[PDB]
């Protein structure tokens, strides 16, 4: 996260760190949507151009973390995965459309002050909140800037949603119905953004009606750090909710 700041403890208790068993390393962000299910980006699991082809026995999720590196005993929960489900219409060969995956925990994770699930959006929350100029919050442990640098604790940033035509016109890459963009404009005195290590983490909005946090997006292609892009691209979670509910119902 670029131009973010240190998370207050428990600020996003749904934040999950996708973590490699061997070597032990941060791979991506992720989010807790129930005591058994974790949401991430598909390209965090399967992306052969970056030599990523992970199976369930390659991976851990670390839940309840604040420090990027410390073993946070008695606060974090480190979990193996039972199964990974990648969206059937995700195709890394073409583009990052439907960049979404579900991770089923081996066991339900116990909730605490530091571990609690985020809400999934419904149609109303999209229509009322997913609007140009409205800000959502992105969290992660990705790099702080270009390498050509890592935070000690989870970073927080608030980002404005970009008008769909404006984002379509900012790039020659196709912005599908399953994506939205977020990020500041060139004349803004804020420059927040997500970087690759933030991929798979949540873009979350606090409802002005009920004080609940709703995960509207998944970081799919941030523009910060080494990408030096214009706007960050996010998986539109609601547009893929049919698949999400299908998997949970079938395999929960």
């Amino acid at each position: 996260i670029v131009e973010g700041w240190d998370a207050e403890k428990g600020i996003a208790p749904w934040q999950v760190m996708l973590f490699r068993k061997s070597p032990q390393e941060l791979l991506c962000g992720a989010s807790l949507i129930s005591d058994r299910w974790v949401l991430t980006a598909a390209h965090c699991i399967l992306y052969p151009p970056w030599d990523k082809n992970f199976t369930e026995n390659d991976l851990l999720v670390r839940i309840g973390k604040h420090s990027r590196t410390r073993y946070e005993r008695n606060v974090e929960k480190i979990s193996m995965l039972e199964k990974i489900y990648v969206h059937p219409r995700y195709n890394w060969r073409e583009n990052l459309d439907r960049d979404i995956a579900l991770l089923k925990l081996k066991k339900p994770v116990p909730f605490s002050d530091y571990i609690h699930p985020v809400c999934l959006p419904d149609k109303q929350t999209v229509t009322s909140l997913l609007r140009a100029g409205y800000k959502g919050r992105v969290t992660g442990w990705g790099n702080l800037r270009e390498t050509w640098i890592q935070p000690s604790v989870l970073q927080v940033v608030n980002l404005p949603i970009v008008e769909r035509p404006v984002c379509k016109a900012s790039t020659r890459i196709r912005i599908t119905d399953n994506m939205f963009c977020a990020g500041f404009k060139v004349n803004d005195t804020k420059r927040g953004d997500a970087c690759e290590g933030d991929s798979g983490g949540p873009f979350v909005m606090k409802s002005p009606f009920n004080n609940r946090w709703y995960q509207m997006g998944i970081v799919s292609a941030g523009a910060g750090c080494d990408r030096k892009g214009k706007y960050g691209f996010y998986t539109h979670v609601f547009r893929l909710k049919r698949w999400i509910q299908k998997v949970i119902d079938q395999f929960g």
Binding site: G10, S112, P117, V118, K206, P208, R212, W213
Partner: peptide
């Protein structure tokens, strides 16, 4: 489920975090 999106250390304790006001203030349309 019914508990989703409410933070034990914030919403459940009637506390606010340092920047959630920025988010609220961004809701300006109508």
């Amino acid at each position: 489920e019914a508990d989703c999106g409410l933070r034990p250390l914030f919403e459940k304790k009637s506390l606010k975090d340092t920047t959630e006001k920025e988010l609220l203030d961004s809701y300006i349309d109508g």
